[PDB]
Amino acid sequence: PLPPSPPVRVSLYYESLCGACRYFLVRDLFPTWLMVMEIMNITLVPYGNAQERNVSGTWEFTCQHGELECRLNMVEACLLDKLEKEAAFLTIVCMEEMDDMEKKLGPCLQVYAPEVSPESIMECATGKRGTQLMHENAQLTDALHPPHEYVPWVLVNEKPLKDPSELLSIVCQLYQGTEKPDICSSIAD
Amino acid sequence: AGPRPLPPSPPVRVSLYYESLCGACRYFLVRDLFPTWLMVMEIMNITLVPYGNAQERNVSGTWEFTCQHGELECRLNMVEACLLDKLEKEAAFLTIVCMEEMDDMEKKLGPCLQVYAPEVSPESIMECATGKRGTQLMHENAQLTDALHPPHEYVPWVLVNEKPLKDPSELLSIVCQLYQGTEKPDICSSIAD
Numbered sequence: 005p006l007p008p009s010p011p012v013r014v015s016l017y018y019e020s021l022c023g024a025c026r027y028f029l030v031r032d033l034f035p036t037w038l039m040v041m042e043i044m045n046i047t048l049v050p051y052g053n054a055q056e057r058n059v060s061g062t063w064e065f066t067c068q069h070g071e072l073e074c075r076l077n078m079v080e081a082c083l084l085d086k087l088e089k090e091a092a093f094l095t096i097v098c099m100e101e102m103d104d105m106e107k108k109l110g111p112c113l114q115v116y117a118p119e120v121s122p123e124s125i126m127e128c129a130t131g132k133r134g135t136q137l138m139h140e141n142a143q144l145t146d147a148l149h150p151p152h153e154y155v156p157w158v159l160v161n162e163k164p165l166k167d168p169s170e171l172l173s174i175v176c177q178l179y180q181g182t183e184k185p186d187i188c189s190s191i192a193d
Numbered sequence: 194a195g196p197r198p199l200p201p202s203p204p205v206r207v208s209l210y211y212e213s214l215c216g217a218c219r220y221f222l223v224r225d226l227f228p229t230w231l232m233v234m235e236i237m238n239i240t241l242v243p244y245g246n247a248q249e250r251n252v253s254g255t256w257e258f259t260c261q262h263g264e265l266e267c268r269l270n271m272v273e274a275c276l277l278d279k280l281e282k283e284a285a286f287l288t289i290v291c292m293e294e295m296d297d298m299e300k301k302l303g304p305c306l307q308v309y310a311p312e313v314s315p316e317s318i319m320e321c322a323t324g325k326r327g328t329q330l331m332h333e334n335a336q337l338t339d340a341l342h343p344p345h346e347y348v349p350w351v352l353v354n355e356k357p358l359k360d361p362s363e364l365l366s367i368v369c370q371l372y373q374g375t376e377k378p379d380i381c382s383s384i385a386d
């Protein structure tokens with residue numbers, strides 16, 4: 005009868021090797037979450053500008069930045085499937101800020117989810133589960149209305165965000181609770 | 194100050210005087226200072242000083258320290274002082290932030306180092322923290338904290354261009370305001386008045 009105010013929903017449609025995607029993830033989405041996580045519900049969709057083709061009964065993917073991007077996309081899809089939400093977010097952010105992403109999977113996992121082996125993540129990423137997860141991200145990305153014009157494509161309560169630097173301000177404004185995080189009142193107009 | 198004939202605007206200087214096990218210190222470090230840096234690092238110069246409310250005593254030729262949260266806090270303070278001495282600035286900042294958000298900090302030193310400074314072994318850091326270098330580094334942090342004018346009334350004690358910051362939630366807004374450059378990070382114009 006009197007539920008708490010709902011969090012602001014943010015969706016990121018991205019690809020692992022897109023420069024603007026990595027900047028927004030690490031220097032916009034992640035720090036905003038660190039500041040106002042209590043009023044934020046983030047969804048990550050690694051697929052971006054990839055393309056998918058049914059080749060002999062199974063889905064195959066082509067990525068704008070090559071096979072490494074397609075493989076890293078599937079690694080992160082498997083992280084989102086096998087880890088708790090916060091652990092997967094932190095591990096993916098950890099990787100995306102690194103020069104050699106594939107080779108930091110183990111170290112980032114050891115920090116945020118040491119109970120999950122990197123080998124089990126790679127088995128998913130190179131196996132049928134990773135292909136199934138990537139196909140689901142393909143369908144989600146294709147269902148965008150309007151379709152995405154570029155990556156990163158950011159939705160805030162299902163509406164496309166045109167200026168990513170406004171993320172923190174818009175999340176604070178859209179939150180319906182009267183008691184906001186202290187940062188929201190500092191940046192308020 | 195260089196270049197000297199048309200130099201770029203200087204960054205905003207931020208100092209954090211803290212102790213490793215203080216709850217308000219860890220929140221401010223991980224959920225205020227770190228994300229502000231992630232947003233506007235280009236206009237920020239951050240200094241970390243691990244010591245906080247610790248106390249210092251010369252007992253028979255060597256400095257010994259007592260921490261409000263016990264021996265574990267004193268040991269973690271010296272680990273982070275040694276990190277600041279042995280790693281590059283950004284790597285030390287990232288490693289310390291990585292540790293301070295964890296439940297078992299001592300056991301995350303190795304893992305956090307493997308992410309941000311794999312060339313530095315945790316064994317070499319622990320040798321420093323438990324050796325003469327860690328004691329000398331901690332004594333230097335004691336002197337810096339004691340030199341605060343005005344003296345700190347609590348931790349975390351945050352200085353923005355050498356002035357105490359009383360509302361930590363205003364950090365991002367104040368850093369953006371104090372920066373003298375005409376071209377600011379895009380976030381600064383979004384939160385601008």
Ligand SMILES: *[C@@H]1O[C@H](CO)[C@@H](O[C@@H]2O[C@H](CO)[C@@H](O[C@@H]3O[C@H](CO)[C@@H](O)[C@H](O)[C@@H]3O)[C@H](O)[C@H]2NC(C)=O)[C@H](O)[C@H]1NC(C)=O
Nearest residue numbers: 009010011012013014015041042043044045046047048089
């Ligand atoms: C943050 O966003 C996600 C996705 O919007 C939320 O997860 C979703 O939570 C709802 C529950 O209201 C799930 O809907 C369905 O609920 C019925 C029970 O009424 C249940 O029988 C169904 O099996 C299903 O769970 C929805 O599936 C679920 N979506 C996903 C991908 O898990 C989440 O609740 C939000 N978190 C917060 C704190 O708001």
Ligand SMILES: *[C@@H]1O[C@H](CO)[C@@H](O[C@@H]2O[C@H](CO)[C@@H](O[C@@H]3O[C@H](CO)[C@@H](O)[C@H](O)[C@@H]3O)[C@H](O)[C@H]2NC(C)=O)[C@H](O)[C@H]1NC(C)=O
Nearest residue numbers: 194195202203204205206207234235236237238239240282
């Ligand atoms: C961020 O803040 C620190 C501390 O204010 C700055 O480091 C300091 O940089 C100056 C030189 O730029 C050093 O002082 C001078 O060094 C020269 C040698 O280059 C010497 O001839 C002078 O007599 C004087 O000693 C100073 O050692 C150094 N202080 C510390 C604690 O490292 C740093 O430059 C700032 N980073 C920026 C603005 O990007």
Ligand SMILES: *[C@@H]1O[C@H](CO)[C@@H](O)[C@H](O)[C@H]1NC(C)=O
Nearest residue numbers: 057058059060061062063064
């Ligand atoms: C992909 O190939 C096989 C049919 O041989 C099957 O899994 C599925 O129906 C096909 N999907 C599409 C869109 O053709």
Ligand SMILES: *[C@@H]1O[C@H](CO)[C@@H](O)[C@H](O)[C@H]1NC(C)=O
Nearest residue numbers: 250251252253254255256332
């Ligand atoms: C600490 O104690 C020693 C005694 O061996 C004394 O000589 C020295 O002056 C003290 N060090 C200081 C005050 O820095």
